[PDB]
């Protein structure tokens, strides 16, 4: 674990084997997950994404996730580029999908690893947020990030957790840059639970998502974003 | 006053010169006011702000004001992106300033306005909040509001005025604007109680106040919030 | 079907009527047993599993009673005026029942935790409470002449082998509430208790019954004395019964 | 010795102060056209036979001058008064003869001293110092009850009690101190005017319900002066 958190707090992002998650559950788990996102509805501002957020709350000297009541979510024009600026309202992800024990499984470790960094005041309130997302995609229609290409979050760590990836899905390709004019690092996530921690220091982006196929394909998403208030 | 509701109504926002307020007080009256800015407590959030908090409740058919004993302060992050989400405890608003006949006429002239308008629903129990506010800054730290840019209010309608501008102060322009690539108004309230009326149709910001001479500055305002329950 | 409709006879196997009850048959039943079991038929009718299942997993986040019994809830009440319809959530929260009804924990307001804005908005929620409200009206059980309180309680009874869960009070009694909704969420299939009885005093029990399935309600008026058998549990990783109470009361 | 009732009110959380304290100056015949004030009070429109005014003053910080609040609605959270709380209740205003009267404003001051040697509420802040003038009225048919009605605790953390007529053909009325609501700690009846009780919200009090056994009717007159924050 602390090798993923030391990876991270150098090179500022850090790829994480499904090993690491899916050590402890069965794949009848994951696909109980998987299934939850049939259900995400779209998201207002459009991109084929379907969504829902929740964030939690971690007391300075506490363990006890408290969940947030309100559901806003804003990212600042300075950082989301496309959908920032204003506040977006989402559906709140099911409770099927929070208190299911991989997901809490897979929080607790994420909190782990953000603990042995100085990405967050660990002083003050923190703030866990979920996005569950799936890029749902057609040949006439496909999907994409909010931000559209190479950017940072407001939250100064964010984890990508793959959840599903239909096999005649394209684009998803994850890339790392250290400018906008160039890219250190393509990486695709594949398989269930297959993860990706983000730091400011870098750039990051998602290729957009299309298919080949006519019935569709989709990429689900678990983001895990960690910040102060 | 029907000509500022209506202004308000069609473009979302309105400016009120001091004299529909000063009607008939004199300025040594506007003064004792503007002197209880001196007591006023820091805002726990911070931005240089000091506050005070009030509210009065309106039942449906009543023009009794009844001033609520709680005092706790919020707005869901789905507005206020900076300090949402979490009631906020400010001191309350002295009576002093409460009770002052120019307080107690800008809020009647206030509410009648309100009443002029579909911003709230005059049925139910309608919630006239106070807030008492300085902008404090000095050479180290200026002041900003919460939310710090462009935004709207939970509550439908906020009354901005103006109790005291130093003349060595920079910035607390106001912005009407439509979206957040766009800004169709600036508007720097100067002249005590020069008011600004803001409904939820725009984003409305407050433009950081800073200092041009190294003693000091402020920007003393009052808001008289509307909404339901 | 020979048994009538409230009949706690309905909750039997292989003593169940078919399809779902007309409202005021229940409504009835009620006025005159001062009780009334209403199948999940009635609830359920028009409510998919997967929408029950979410506000059903709302309960592990409950905290707890502070007056103990291994119970761990919220309140929200709403307010109905006169000739209204428009429920009006009450800002206040403290809950109090006189002693006179509630032996254990009543002659002091209790502060709980307010019932989720998810649970109390979900369509179901809001569903249950306007079928209640109407059963409600069809009975002089409240004076719909004035402010009428409708209140909730979300109630888990949470049980582990060591500590078993029980009712506020523990036996039989009256509420102050004139008329109260017992609407079953969940029910841990290795939970013993949580029996509900009927009573026409404290020396003699007329029903005992048991709710089981999701929706599966019982209303009970201030006529006759009810209780709730405790729960407890077998199985060591506990069990629990979710419960949401809906009262109906004067100001 | 004032800090004598102050230093015992601290500790157990109330104090009988006799009629002496305060009436040891003033004249029966001032005290009595006080009393004849509670002859024109309106009805509570909660009932129970109470008849009532209400108005309240502020103390700001560092200030001896109570200004009086033209406002005049009187709330208690359902959390403390469990009958009547919840809701803002519209009382008359307490007539600026009984305010201003000597004997009341005597009793005021002397209140707000023993209430300053007390942590109650914190004088920091802006304290309120509400009054009430409360009439029990009572006929066979009819008796007399306080909101609420039993053992409580009141939201104001300090509450005085001073009686101002007891009718001698009156029942009840007695203020009960206790612990909890299973046990009573202290039974005591006020009859003379002016004889007080202090009431901290470490305690429950309640009083006993007014009855009487005349059909011309009975009445316990009282004025409360309540110490808390805003
Ligand atoms: C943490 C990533 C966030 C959710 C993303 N930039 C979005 O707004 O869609
Ligand atoms: C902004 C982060 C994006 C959404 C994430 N890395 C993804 O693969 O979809
Ligand atoms: C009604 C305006 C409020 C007070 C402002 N957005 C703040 O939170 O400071
Ligand atoms: C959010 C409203 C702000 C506080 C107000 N318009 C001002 O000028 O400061
Ligand atoms: C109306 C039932 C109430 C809520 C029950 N006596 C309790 O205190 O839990
Ligand atoms: C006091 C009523 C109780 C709480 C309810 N009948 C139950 O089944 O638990
Ligand atoms: C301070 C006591 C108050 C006045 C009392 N509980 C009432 O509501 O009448
Ligand atoms: C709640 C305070 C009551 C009304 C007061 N102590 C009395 O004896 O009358």
Redesign the interface.
């Given at each position: 674990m602390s090798n993923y958190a030391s990876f991270l707090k150098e090179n500022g992002y850090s790829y994480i084997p499904a090993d690491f998650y899916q050590q402890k559950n069965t794949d009848a788990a994951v696909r109980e997950l998987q299934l939850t996102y049939e259900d995400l509805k779209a998201d207002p501002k459009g991109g084929g994404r379907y969504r829902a957020h929740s964030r939690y709350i971690l007391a300075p000297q506490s363990d006890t996730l408290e969940?947030?009541?309100?559901?806003?979510y804003?990212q600042?024009?300075e950082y989301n580029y496309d959908d920032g600026?204003?506040?977006r309202?989402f559906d709140?992800i099911?409770?099927?999908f929070l208190?299911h024990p991989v997901t809490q499984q897979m929080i607790h470790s994420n909190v782990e690893m953000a603990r042995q960094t100085d990405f967050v005041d660990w002083e003050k309130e923190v703030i866990v947020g979920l996005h569950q997302i799936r890029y749902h995609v057609t040949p006439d229609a496909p999907s994409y990030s909010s931000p559209i290409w190479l950017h940072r979050d407001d939250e100064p760590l964010v984890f990508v957790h793959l959840f599903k990836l239909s096999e005649d899905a394209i684009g998803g390709d994850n890339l790392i840059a250290p400018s906008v004019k160039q890219i250190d690092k393509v990486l695709r996530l594949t398989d269930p639970l297959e993860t990706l921690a983000l730091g400011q220091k870098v750039f990051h982006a998602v290729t957009p998502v299309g298919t080949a196929n006519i019935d569709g394909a989709h990429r689900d998403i678990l983001l895990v974003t960690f910040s102060n208030?």
């Open positions: 969940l947030d009541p309100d559901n806003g804003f600042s024009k600026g204003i506040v309202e709140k099911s409770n099927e208190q208030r």
